[PDB]
């Protein structure tokens, strides 16, 4: 399959309580593998996946100082954006960054992305071409213009096409046993009463990896439905559920179907 390296980046000003909080969290696919948090005792990049213990002192030093530069860089952006948006200097604000690359199974680039949001609204993003920017508003244009004049897209493209890809390969290979594994869903269906004479049928899928899965309910052929977003279960696997309200005495005519990378035939079950 194809795979991803992702960094979720967040800087959060806390005026009156000191310097902004800076976090970088990295994933390969759906697995958290690295993290820096400026609020840790002594902030440095740390492994979040066992396979990253392989990497030597130079790697952790190089990522940590990169991390610490970015912390400063986002420190400045927060102050800069107050200017851009004529904002008071006493409120807390957020910058978020999604940065990464996807590759296909041949280990070649499918997609690169880097997207910014200020206070939860889009600010700026690399476009798919990997040479131009799309800015969400008038403020983002100012930024856009700086990056064009400084040639940031081309530096970012060197990263998405070079550094980002080669390290994703490295990590997959280094974490093959964890990252290329598949754990299959185990499913089961639970029953609840209600009024007036109805019934909630809830289908559970548990213990699966990767996070991707599809749960559907059926009344004899036609697909039907409350659910939750697929969610991490604390050990590097995921779970989900999907429920339908049916008539009491008609439960047998409804079945739950579960489709996952680890199910050659999708599962079929009923209460």
């Amino acid at each position: 399959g194809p795979h991803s390296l992702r960094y979720f980046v967040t800087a959060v000003s806390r005026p009156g309580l000191g310097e902004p909080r800076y976090m970088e969290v990295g994933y390969v696919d759906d697995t958290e593998f690295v993290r820096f948090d400026s609020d840790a005792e002594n902030p440095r990049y740390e492994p979040r996946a066992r396979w990253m213990e392989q990497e030597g002192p130079e790697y952790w030093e190089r990522e940590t100082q990169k991390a610490k530069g970015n912390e400063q860089s986002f420190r400045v952006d927060l102050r800069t954006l107050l200017g851009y948006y004529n904002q008071s200097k006493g409120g807390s604000h957020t910058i978020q960054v999604i940065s990464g690359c996807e590759v296909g199974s041949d280990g070649r680039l499918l997609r690169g992305y880097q997207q910014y949001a200020y206070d939860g609204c889009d600010y700026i993003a690399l476009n798919e071409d990997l040479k131009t920017w799309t800015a969400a508003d008038m403020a983002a244009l100012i930024t856009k213009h700086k990056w064009e004049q400084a040639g940031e897209a081309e530096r970012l493209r060197a990263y998405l096409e070079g550094t980002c890809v080669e390290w994703l390969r490295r990590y997959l290979k280094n974490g093959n046993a964890t990252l290329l594994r598949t754990d299959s869903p185990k499913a089961h269906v639970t029953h609840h009463s209600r009024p007036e004479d109805k019934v909630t049928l809830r289908c559970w899928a548990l213990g699966f990896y990767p996070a991707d899965i599809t749960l559907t309910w059926q009344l004899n052929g036609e697909e039907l439905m409350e659910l939750v977003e697929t969610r991490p279960a604390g050990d590097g696997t995921f779970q989900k559920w999907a429920s339908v309200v049916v008539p009491l005495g008609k439960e047998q005519y409804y079945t739950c179907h579960v489709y996952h990378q680890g199910l050659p035939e999708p599962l079929t079950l009923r209460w």
Binding site: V9, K66, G69, S73, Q114, Y123, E152, T163, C164
Partner: peptide
Amino acid sequence: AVYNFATM
């Protein structure tokens, strides 16, 4: 490995 982020 993360990118060195630019300023805005």
